[PDB]
Amino acid sequence: NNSIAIPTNFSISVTTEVMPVSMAKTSVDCTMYICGDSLECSNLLLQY
Amino acid sequence: VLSFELLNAPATVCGPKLSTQLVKNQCVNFNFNGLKGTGVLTPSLKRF
Cβ A27 vs Cβ B28: under 8 Å? no
Mutation target to probe the A interface, by most A beta carbons within 10 A, among B27, B29, B38, B40 is B38
Residues of B with CB below 8 A from A39's CB?
Answer: 38
Technique used to solve these coordinates: cryo-EM
Q: Is A37 on the interface with B (CB under 8 A)?
A: yes
Residues of B with CB below 8 A from A35's CB?
Answer: none
Tell which residue, A46, A35, A44, A47, has the closest CA to residue B38.
Answer: A35
d(CA B23, CA B44): 14
For A1-48, give the DSSP string: -----------------------------STTTTS-S-HHHHHHGGG-
d(CA A40, CA B37): 11
